Structure formats: C-alpha cells, structure tokens
C-alpha cells in the first residue's frame, strides 16, 4: 500500500477489506418477516430528500432508497468503476471491474469480475468514504474518495442528488504505465414506479461542455417522454478533464446482453469508441460509459474527478400524493436537469470537501476523544440521508413558505418522525440542521387539536379506537405507504392517544430546540405555546388517583410498546416532571404568569410524590404497581437526562441520581455480557435480566447512547464511554455482529437484532452537547 500516503484518510474511518467475508453476522430475532440485507453495506450517497444510493464496501451500487420511503437491496451490475493498465513494453494490458463479486446470470459475462481479496480496503467517515486498490497485477495504485455535500447549517447543497468520485492514481514502479478508469451506469429510468414497459423510450445522450479551462464530458440517461411522473427524470455520469488525461465515452451499450459491445473496446487499450447514439430502446436495458486514459511515469500522481447525479423530481406515496423533492428549488422541476447538477458538482467539489473538513475538524482534532467514538459519531449520521428522508418543495399540481420534512423511524415500521423515538433520534437535526428540526416540531404543533373520529383496530388486543384525539400528540406523521404529513398516526399496534410519554416528550423537544439554538427563538416558543399547554393539561387528566402524576394503565402505553407499566413509572413520571419544569420556564420567557404558577404547582406536588413512591435507597423503582415493579430500568431517569440538556437543574436529588446511574452501570451494563454490548433495558435486583417482556431483555442502541450522554454530563466519564463502547463494538468491530450502516433498534444477548436501519441511535449526538 503506497497509495494511502497520497490521500488523506482519517484514522477514525471505519475500515474493512474489499471482498472480506464476515463470519459473525446477526439476523432478526422476531417471528414475523423483517429486513435483513446482509452485512455487505456502505456509507450512502445522496442528499437529504434526494433519494439515496448505498454503494457497498465491495463496490456495488446495491442499497437503493431512490423510491422515497422504500428500501430495495439489489446490485445493479452495470453500475461500476473499472480499470485498465498496461506497462510500457508489454503486448497486452489488463482490465478489471472494481467489484468483489459477479452477476448472478449471464448479463455482462464478458466483463472481468471478481475483484480479488486482500487487494484493497474500504474506509468510511460519513459523509466521506474511500476505496484503495493495491493489487499485485495492477502496477499503478489507485484510490477514490466518494461523497455527497452533506454540510451542517446548509440546506442547499445538503439536498442535492449528487455524488463525487475523486480518483488518485500513483505509479510506484520504475516503468511507464498506461491507465484508464471507466465509470459505467445503467439507464435506470423505469427501475421503479413504472407499472409496464420498463425500459421503453429510454435513451442516452452525450454532453460536451467545453469552455476555457473546463471540459466536462457527461452521459445523460433519460426517456423520450416529457411526462411529469415519479418514474421519469434523468441520471447522469461524467468527468472533468484535467491536464494529462484524455476522455473517451460510449453513449449506448446493452445491459441486458453480454457487455462485449463495451468491454472489447475497454479491455484492448482502455479507450472507448466515442460513439454517440440517441436511439431509444424498447425492451433491452441500456447504459452509458465515461472513461479517462493517461500515462503515469515513475513516481507520478494524478487526480481526476467523476460524478453521478439523478434528477427524479417527483416522489409519490402509496396514498396517492405526489410531491416535488427539495433540490428542485435549486435546479427546477421538469426532470431534465441532471447535467446541471453534475456540472455544479464537478466544478465545486473541492470547496465541498473543505466545507466537510471544516465541520468534522473540531471533533477530529480533539485528541482527548478516542477514535472509536469518532467512528460512531460520524458514521451514525448515515441515517439522516438513508432514513427514507422526505423533504418537499410543493405538492404536484399545487397552486407556501415552508418545506415539510420527515425522517422514518425505520423501514420495517414505516412511520415518519415517530415522536417517542425522535426524542432520542433528533439530536443531529437540532445541533446541525436546526431549521429542519424547528419545521418538524411546528408540524407536530399543528396536529395537537386535530380530531379524527374514525376507528382503527388496535393490533395488540383487537379493540377499536379513535384515530386521533384532540389535545393528544400523534405517534407519527404517517407512512410512505399512505399519506405523509396528511394522515397522521399510521401506527396501530397500540393506541397512541392514551400514551403517557408523547405529550411530555413533545414539550421537552420544544424547549430543547429553544435551548440548543441559543435561547433566542421566542417566535418558535410563541408558535408552539398553545400546543405545549394543551399537551400538559390533557396529560394531567390521566392522573387517576390524584398524586399529581399521570397513571400508566397496566398496558404498554409508551415507547416500550410491549413492556407494561402501571401506576407511577420512573420513565413517564420523570418525563412529566421535566416537562412541567420546561413549561414553567417557557411561561417565564413568554410572560404567561398563570401558566408559570399552575405548572409550578403541579411540579412541586408531582416531584414530592414521585420521590416518595419510587426512591428505594439505591435507585428509582420501575413503577408502583407492576409485578416486577422493583426492576432496574436503564431509562428510569430519562426526564432528568433531558433536564440536564435543557439546563433545568435538579428535578431529583443529585445524590439519588448519581446512585441510580451507578446502579444502572453496575447492573444493566456490567452484569449483561460483561458490559460489552450496551445497557440491557430491565434487570432484576438479584442481577438477572428481567424476563417479563422481550423489550426488558433487549439493549436499545439509542437508549444506551443517551444514557452514556447522561453519565457523561454527571461526571461519570469512564462509565459513559464504556457503556457506549459496547454499542460501537457490536455495530462496527470485527468482534461485533455486522450492523455498520444499518444500526438497529435493539439486540438481545445472543447479538441478534430487531429493526435494522433505525432512527433512535442518532442519539449518540447527545454526547456532544
Ligand atoms: O421498538 C419499539 C418501537 O416499535 C415501533 O414499532 C414503534 O413505532 C415505536 O413507537 C416503538 O418505540
Ligand atoms: Ca397518578
């Protein structure tokens, strides 16, 4: 490996061998079907609301999130980088697809597949990833840095459906070597969203943009139809000329054929035919190829940028609504703009790299933090782009100031912005894209007094319930299978209108969003104040025994949606205390004296009773009425965790909080698989895991990172990092279960998982407050 020295990969990048097999991988531990796309994954490409494309560590473009809200894992074999090298003095050169695998059928059989093992590495530190190619039959060493411009406090480039591939080539040998790098791409119009004739009308064109000191050559892969539909638009690939390289291209090769129409050209001398051909296809799949060729002398380095864009302007949801994606604000809505996007990237990528470096640098340069923590912190952010992210710039056919936003909880439970989960998972948005965060919270504010009297069947017990109750915060803002933003509470396993955490979490999120953006946004507190008051007032009505605290009803009426709570619970009870304290403070800020006084009164009574009912000398009991009410819950003081973040002070005595956290570390962490797998949710005082429900026996990744953040603010530095390290290890390490770029909600002691690609572990960003 002589190429690593010519590029700059941070030491905290996650690493794996190209073609590496992983032997320890986990699988779903539930009885119903659940997504398991394997451990062959990578950092995604694509902006927020753009649709994303997962290119895996083996080099394939395989995890397709271009249909917004859906996860489709299938390698499109035509989409690759390939290399040709010939040493001056040899009769023949060699050509190789940079893909550690081969197609399942006979398409593209002429291409040279099966990039060999032990011949290169993949590295990731989101939004950047890299591949290095160090192969005994390739005298010139190559590396590529690939990324999309995901930039905090930037709502523009961050939305773009674009990726850059910056190649570096170095000749460590003592002979001249001719090198070519080729990007191939299938015209994927019709890959989704087209019910019949899936390739029909697809055609490819070549754009040559020549102006002083710029030449870009690109393929634009579109369809002859000018219809405005979810399925129509354009893909583009292309390259910018640099001194010392020549560009060649092929406009049309057949992807549903043996590939030799292209490969016979490339494998001969690394130079394509430059054949334009706009003839549309009927049944056959088609693709384009863009290549560069250059000669490297001994000791010479060259850098060359390629790019990929996709202009698919319309997203459609299963309930019928069609919306424009956010990037259309910057490039237009007609779906004929892939070249403009590609050009913007090829002309600005150096600036983008520097903007990404500038935001990562404060963390990366802090030598008090271990590298493993940096690996997790940055790579967990993959989910902001990969989570079915929807960001609208108008409804199609619509005759507004704001752009609605939604991140899925996950793909198996296909719900937008699940509030009980975003309480943990939304930290990166508030910290790094706060205008999006405030938009999402205003969306929730607007739902508070919505009433929907239609009924649904509750999944857990079969009872009928009202869809949406006035004054109750919704569980979610809909499903991609239905009508995001329009039809709320798609979730139906339990009835969220009787949950005891949603209304409190809502309030806490509101105050969080004010505090963590500088305590300056009074307008945001003004917009949300009525809903905050309404939310707390409605929750107060659920106090059945006048102790001043809402009663859990002996069923799962909160985020642990199979784990029953009854009476006053540490979890919902502490959230309530904190939410009352937050509402007092908002009342002070907005000079609503009667609100301040009322919530202060409720707080003092509830606080006194919470401590009496639950403090047992060592920790706070799980609740007051359940069969295992004395279980040690990992999340027992969630309200105090948020109070620390919101700077609301002590809601419970410092000494008692410290004792509780120490007990959780001693038990839920250190007595669960020797503290190497996170914090298990429920443990009995005798040190055996609580078996009352599956959720008690799970580690929740986002709960564990949040608990780590809580320990950290409370000075328990070693315990905080040791607690988080188990989640990092399970996710990323060779000794783990292979969950990189698909961090799940939960695992059990055997390492197997529930709900890969989950929002909650974005809570790791709470460790940076
Ligand atoms: O793992 C528990 C989670 O399951 C999901 O199906 C629900 O939508 C969440 O509200 C819940 O917290
Ligand atoms: Ca009560």
Automatic annotation (TrEMBL):
Residues 405-767 form the Glycosyl-hydrolase family 116 catalytic region domain. The keyword Calcium applies. GO terms for biological process: carbohydrate metabolic process; glucosylceramide catabolic process. Its EC number is 3.2.1.45. One of its GO terms (molecular function) is glucosylceramidase activity. One of its GO terms (cellular component) is membrane. The keyword 4Fe-4S does not apply. Keywords: Calcium, Glycosidase, Hydrolase, Metal-binding. Residues 42-352 form the Glycosyl-hydrolase family 116 N-terminal domain. InterPro entries: 6-hairpin_glycosidase_sf (IPR008928), 6hp_glycosidase-like_sf (IPR012341), B_Glucosidase_GBA2-typ (IPR014551), GH116_catalytic (IPR006775), GH116_N (IPR024462), Non-lysos_glucosylceramidase (IPR052566). Ca(2+) binds at residues 543, 545, 547, 549, 551. It comes from the Bacteria. This is Glucosylceramidase.
